[PDB]
Design a protein around this nucleic acid. Structure first.
Length: 1280
RNA sequence: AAUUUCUACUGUUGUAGAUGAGAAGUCA
DNA sequence: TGACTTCTCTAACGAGCTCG
DNA sequence: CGAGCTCGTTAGAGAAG
């Protein structure tokens, strides 16, 4: 029987059921008449015009907290010393010191911000509404905008001036419940974490590493060039700009021209860093544009362009000075129309190309001159770095025709340079190091050429020539701008979406190409650019001339990845607008509690006429319909208005009502009890109120202070309806678990009848707006299975729920409304034969008596109802969930038949039920989805869309209509994974995407396979089966909670519940029977160096009766230690070889017939029947050894597509213990069948040894769930 | 080619499966 | 480029307000 | 300014590895 009987109703989560309202009776006629929904646009669309007001005031607060901060020089001298140690000498134990050196400067400001006076009333209610004596801070500044005559609008923003903004900001009087995600996603702007958009993460990582860099290029400038910077001219010329009102070390209030000898001081760090101080610093260092003289009076960086120009020294051009970047939330829009689909692009290629710079070098010539200055080795090669991730692999792709030739040369040269006989430092100098210099690259490429002939060289000059193939890409952009200027005169229309239709295919493919040769252009400069990453915080001895001109042409060119995603998210949408908004019935309280006592203001209540469900929203002004005297007066039959009783919090309510100004006399205790609440002695560790202090808990308190609550609850007027069943008060350890005694039992839901004729008349009177929630299950024309957001709603109100409560209703439901997006167009009229679209369905015809408008749910207005509920409310929460599982299946480990999912070359997954020994019980593909009614082949449905016999092969409309259908496949297949893990009650084991993941070209990408393990963790955390009994396990309330929730992809680790994780390195290229891995990689390193490598083979011999040659090897005679054992690989069957398609598509080559040819071509004899050891090693030729490697580039290839997309079977070199060779044309059911069946059976074998560790668990709860290749390659081979 | 929304649908005024919503700095 | 925060998941009371 | 009147305060567990 299923072992997961225990894993039922375990923890709590809150899904939100959504519905459509039906305006019934005369509900909609009163709404349109009084102007209700038309005056709802002005406070559900218009707050986006108020989110332009709040952030601008949130920008004025930046200007008046950073010009009001004064940080010490003690934490700048503790920064700048470590800031210059790591440049000249980077190490490990100073990174812990550098982080703590910058931790208490990003926290010392983070405690100054949270202790100001404009901050506590800015992320809460009181930002926008005024107190009776305290007028709020938004309305003061907009009046202060008039108090000084400032003209903040009609020059920068959308609103005319502040006078209409004075009207707009008073449209949110009691409406403070809007901004609660707009005021939660701006607590990251003042967050002390490492998130990359703040003002305290930025002034420690974007200007403080740039200002202290720019001080070393000023102390090393006055001694090396005294005459250069004319001090006496910049005092007179820019005297108005240099009026810095405050100094640091003297705290002057002297509005005077500062001295340039002291503005570059480390102590003077606080004279800037608002929006108007970085402007002042970048006025001197970049020049001041004043067009009153028709010339530029350019500052100190013009003096470097005069002093080093005359005497002609390019070492003072190393000492140029940089530009500080502009602060986050400066003064600087998602796309929906087509009037601005072109001028968000044609007004960018005017900005990225047609602009005159400061020093007069156009951006075509900047990458032209600098890469030509790098061409003949002029710049220093030990200061320009490569990004050491697999983006440098792409730099080896375009010119070296190999992926890992650079990453091996910086592993081969560093091997001989430091530890030439391999032991500790050898990894992090070239592998874990985030950057490698060109001097390290050049001394690794003119060393590998010394051990290689003329045919296969690897020249450093080709990398310099590859970068010279960059600066003429800007010339064909200047040719495409002559092509893409005839389209901007064709789209002058405002909102019509004729660039999204399928007729202009010849005008969208002129845009994807132009946004692809400016998106690999940024992916070839990506290997240069410095990263401000974490755990290394990358700082090295950088170049002084390269990385100042490169930042001119990267961070101005980097504004295309937030612009390429503004088009590919515009073309790949659907032709209707899902722009909905919430409607409120002239009330800031729509569904907040649903409670019976608090519903003249919660405004809403539900109904049931014994089959379907309704919503009744009372009109807020005349809401006197159900004030407890018209229910008994109108009792009868019909609707079944609920009384809903809720008690949120046994921390927040039970001291609020039992120690109030009213009910304190009704439950009168002695002063023995009153000393507890004052000093907070009942709490183990909490918070007393003002007046007293915290004391120590004793066991006498919370076995009698709870008894105060038992007499207080049992005499309450409206809190006797719950019927509490509290346990024995001696068995109460704390009040945190007496919370859980009050909170779950403080919830009842029973029914009271109302005569149907009254509340059919009050909707006719116009006081009860009545609505019906429905789906395709709550209509009368259905018989099949419901949805899951309708099988939950029918369990909020069932009687078997309310016995032992599971589905709790929550407050703050939210009513939404959606306008008319697309017009009504009947695409399938009545009595017309329509075409089938399934290649297995017999009934090819389709004639409908009723019409079908194309997706008509976006043609007519829909009132919505988004209703959060709570699942398993009575039970506990989620603490140490995955540790409970491993401590449970230890006595149930011999019931667990491990399921295992992979990616796919030909398939999409190959889920495989591996047994404990390893014999596959039931494997099947994941291309055929469904029960015997209809069957759908998503493999064939991909293969007709996936860039196959389609229009133009490159447009964005394909590559998401693959992906959304591929994502819609992920919505399908998670049910067919869930059915297996209950029928075969085991586990899921995916492939992790942290480290150790598969690399090749698959259908399922890296992107759309982490979502299939994201959409499985949120459909195995709460798992309901639509065809199971209600009160039985696996049903609706007694359902499957087997995993934990989803926090991040990083926090999945090796285990997040029943879904384990294993690596995905070397699982698809292994013989399943014996465990061979091709670790003896042939690459044709040299002619003579291969000769001792063929003697590292034990014997290259032949057998008479066997009839096949063999390359016997053992791994003890060569490095990169992976496994052991005498192999004697064979040359039995045929191996296909892939080729460059386009003709030269596919041809078959036999290994043995090639070995018969290529060995009889020279004088080597074989036919005696013994070893050919010395004969193969004795031969010396260029062509011979460059061709025998192509035999070993074929005898070890274990994937072979038979023709174009037919089938790829599996072959095995290494023998069994009998003599037979594994061949998947005759493989049994307990062995893999296809090529993707071998990439899934080893993901289970590497997952089955997780379960070997877990069944042998001990008292040490430090379960080594990590996999090393020495552990896996030993387990898979000798398991029998 | 119909849906609380999404994907494929004819599975027939809808069938099989998924659905956590308002939110939204945006790393790159 | 697809994920990075962590909450509100609420009833009752003391409050100045037409009214008494 | 008590009639109670629609508001904007306000009461303040112990999990979180």
């Amino acid at each position: 029987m299923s072992i997961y009987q225990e894993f039922v109703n375990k923890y709590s989560l809150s899904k939100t059921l959504r519905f459509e309202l039906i305006p019934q009776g005369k509900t909609l006629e009163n709404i349109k008449a009084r102007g209700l929904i038309l005056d709802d646009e002005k406070r559900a669309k218009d707050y986006k015009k108020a989110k332009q007001i709040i952030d601008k005031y949130h920008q004025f607060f930046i200007e008046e907290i950073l010009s009001s901060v004064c940080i010490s020089e003690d934490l700048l001298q503790n920064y700048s010393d470590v800031y210059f140690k790591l440049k000249k000498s980077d190490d490990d134990n100073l990174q812990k010191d550098f982080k703590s050196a910058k931790d208490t400067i990003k926290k010392q400001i983070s405690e100054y911000i949270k202790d100001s006076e404009k901050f506590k009333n800015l992320f809460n209610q009181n930002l926008i509404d005024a107190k009776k004596g305290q007028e709020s801070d938004l309305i003061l500044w907009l009046k202060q905008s008039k108090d000084n005559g400032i003209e903040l609008f009609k020059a920068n923003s959308d609103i005319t001036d502040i006078d209409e903004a004075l009207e707009i900001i008073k449209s949110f009087k009691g409406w403070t419940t809007y901004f609660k995600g707009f005021h939660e996603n701006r607590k990251n702007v003042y967050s002390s974490n490492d998130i990359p958009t703040s003002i305290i993460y930025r002034i420690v990582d974007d200007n403080l590493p740039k200002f202290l860099e720019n001080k070393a290029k000023y102390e090393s400038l006055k001694d090396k060039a005294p005459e250069a910077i004319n001090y006496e001219q910049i005092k007179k010329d820019l005297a108005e700009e240099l009026t810095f009102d405050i100094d640091y070390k003297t705290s002057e209030v002297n509005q005077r021209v500062f001295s340039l000898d002291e503005v570059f001081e480390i102590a003077n760090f606080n004279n800037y860093l608002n929006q108007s101080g970085i402007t002042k610093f970048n006025t001197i260092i970049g020049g001041k544009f004043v067009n009153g003289e028709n010339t530029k009076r350019k500052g100190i960086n013009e003096y470097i362009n005069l002093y080093s120009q005359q005497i002609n020294d390019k070492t003072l051009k190393k000492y140029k000075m940089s530009v500080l970047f502009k602060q986050i939330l400066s003064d600087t829009d998602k796309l929906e129309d087509d009037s601005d689909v072109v001028t968000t692009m044609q007004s960018f290629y005017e900005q990225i190309a047609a602009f005159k710079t400061v020093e007069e070098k156009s951006i075509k010539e900047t990458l032209s001159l600098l890469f030509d200055d790098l061409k003949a080795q002029k710049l220093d090669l030990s200061k320009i770095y490569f990004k050491n991730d697999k983006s440098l692999t792409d730099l080896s792709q375009q010119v070296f025709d190999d992926y890992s030739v650079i990453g091996t040369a910086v592993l081969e040269y560093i091997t001989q340079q430091i530890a030439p006989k391999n032991q500790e430092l050898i990894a992090k100098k070239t592998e874990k190091a985030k950057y490698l210099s060109l001097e390290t690259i050049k001394l690794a490429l003119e060393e590998f050429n010394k051990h290689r002939d003329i045919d296969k060289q690897c020249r450093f000059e080709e990398i310099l020539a590859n970068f010279a193939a960059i600066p003429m890409i800007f010339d064909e952009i200047a040719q495409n701008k002559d092509n893409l200027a005839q389209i901007s005169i064709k789209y002058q229309n405002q909102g019509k979406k004729d660039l999204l239709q399928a007729s202009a295919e010849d005008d969208v493919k002129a845009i994807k190409d132009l946004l692809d040769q400016t998106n690999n252009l940024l992916h070839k400069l990506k290997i240069f650019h410095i990263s401000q990453s974490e755990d290394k915080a990358n700082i090295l001895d950088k170049d002084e001339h390269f990385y100042l001109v490169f930042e001119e042409c990267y961070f101005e060119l980097a504004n295309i990845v937030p612009l390429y995603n503004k088009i590919r998210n515009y073309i790949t949408q659907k032709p209707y607008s899902d722009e909905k908004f919430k409607l409120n019935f002239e009330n800031s309280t729509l569904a907040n509690g649903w409670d019976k006592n608090k519903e003249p203001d919660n405004t809403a209540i539900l109904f049931i006429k014994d089959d379907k469900y309704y919503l009744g929203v009372m009109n807020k002004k005349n809401n006197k319909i159900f004030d407890d005297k018209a229910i008994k007066e109108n009792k009868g039959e019909g609707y079944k208005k609920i009384v809903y009783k809720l008690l949120p919090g046994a921390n927040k309510m039970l001291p609020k009502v039992f120690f109030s100004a009213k009910s304190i006399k009704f439950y009168n205790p002695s002063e023995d009890i009153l000393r507890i609440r004052n000093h907070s002695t009942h709490t183990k560790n909490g918070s007393p109120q003002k007046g007293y202090e915290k004391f120590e808990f004793n066991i006498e308190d919370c076995r009698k202070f709870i008894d105060f609550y038992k007499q207080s609850i049992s005499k309450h007027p409206e809190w006797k309806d719950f019927g509490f069943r509290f346990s024995d008060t001696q068995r109460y350890n704390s009040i945190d678990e007496f919370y859980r005694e009050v909170e779950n039992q403080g919830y009842k839901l029973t029914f009271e009848n109302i005569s149907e004729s009254y509340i059919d008349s009050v909707v006719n009177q116009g006081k009860l707006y009545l609505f019906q929630i429905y789906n395709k299950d709550f209509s009368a024309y259905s018989k099949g299975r419901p949805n899951l957001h309708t099988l939950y709603w029918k369990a909020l109100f069932d009687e078997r729920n309310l016995q032992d409560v599971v589905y709790k209703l929550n407050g703050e439901a939210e009513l939404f409304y959606r306008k008319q997006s697309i017009p009504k167009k009947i695409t399938h009229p009545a009595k017309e034969a329509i075409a089938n679209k399934n290649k297995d369905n017999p009934k090819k015809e389709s004639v409908f008596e009723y019409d079908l408008i194309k997706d008509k749910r976006f043609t007519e207005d829909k009132f919505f109802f988004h209703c959060p509920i709570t699942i398993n409310f009575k039970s506990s929460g989620a603490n140490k969930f995955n540790d409970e599982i491993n401590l449970l299946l230890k006595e149930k480990a011999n019931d667990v038949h491990i399921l295992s999912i992979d990616r796919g070359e030909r398939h999409l997954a190959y889920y495989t039920l591996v047994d404990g020994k390893g014999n596959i019980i039931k494997q099947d593909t994941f291309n055929i989805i469904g029960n015997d009614r209809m069957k759908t082949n998503y493999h064939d449905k991909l293969a007709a869309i996936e860039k196959d016999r389609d229009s133009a092969r490159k447009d964005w409309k394909k590559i998401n209509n693959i992906k959304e259908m591929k994502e819609g496949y992920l919505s399908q297949v998670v049910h067919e994974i869930a059915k297996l893990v209950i029928e075969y009650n085991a586990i899921v084991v995916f492939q992790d995407l942290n480290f150790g993941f598969k690399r090749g070209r698959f259908k399922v990408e890296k992107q759309v396979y982490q979502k299939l393990e994201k959409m499985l963790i949120e459909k195995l955390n709460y798992l309901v089966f639509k065809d199971n009994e209600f009160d039985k396990t696996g049903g609706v309330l007694r359902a499957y909670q087997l995993t934990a929730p989803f926090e991040t992809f990083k926090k999945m680790g090796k285990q997040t519940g029943i879904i384990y994780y294993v690596p995905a390195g070397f699982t698809s290229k292994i013989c399943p029977v014996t465990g061979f891995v091709n670790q003896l990689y042939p690459k044709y390193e040299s002619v003579s160096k291969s000769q001792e490598f063929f003697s590292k083979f034990d014997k290259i011999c032949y057998n008479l009766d066997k009839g096949y040659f063999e390359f016997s090897f053992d791994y003890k005679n060569f490095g990169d230690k992976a496994a052991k054992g005498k192999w004697t690989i064979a040359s039995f069957g045929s191996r296909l070889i892939n080729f460059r398609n386009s003709n030269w598509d596919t041809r078959e080559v036999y290994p043995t017939k090639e070995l018969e040819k290529l060995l009889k071509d020279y004088s080597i004899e074989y036919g005696h029947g013994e070893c050919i050891k010395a004969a193969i090693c004795g031969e010396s030729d260029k062509k011979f050894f460059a061709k025998l490697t192509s035999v070993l580039n074929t005898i070890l290839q274990m994937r072979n597509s038979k023709t174009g997309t037919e089938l790829d079977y599996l072959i095995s070199p290494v023998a069994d213990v009998n003599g037979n060779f594994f061949d998947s044309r005759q493989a049994p059911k307990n062995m893999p069948q296809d090529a993707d069946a071998n990439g899934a059976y080893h993901i289970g074998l590497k997952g089955l040894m997780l379960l070997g560790r877990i069944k042998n668990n001990q008292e040490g709860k430090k379960l080594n769930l990590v996999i090393k290749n020495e552990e896996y390659f030993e387990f898979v081979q000798n398991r029998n």
